Amino acid sequence: GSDYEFLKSWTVEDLQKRLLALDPMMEQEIEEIRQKYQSKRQPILDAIEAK
Amino acid sequence: GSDYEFLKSWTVEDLQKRLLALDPMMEQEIEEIRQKYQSKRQPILDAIEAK
């Protein structure tokens, strides 16, 4: 529970720091999932390729 | 604690089920994050665009 509607009153420097930080926020989460599920998908490809 | 190495002896159907299920599985894990962060990004843009 936290709201960001008050960003309208924050300095350009404080809000900019959230915008740039928003990039590695979604990136880390996505890359990790892409890798983790790739780990789970890998043996599946390896299996069908061996039948 | 869930191994999927035994997949080498699965039927093409049992194996393929995991492969195809893997498609919407990652898609939903990622889109949830894209949606979530885009909602948090939206007010950040609005704030700088108002300065």
Curated annotation (Swiss-Prot), chains A, B:
Full protein name: Serine/threonine-protein kinase 4 18kDa subunit
Residue numbers of Phosphotyrosine PTMs: 4
Domain spans labelled SARAH: 4-51
Domain of life: Eukaryota
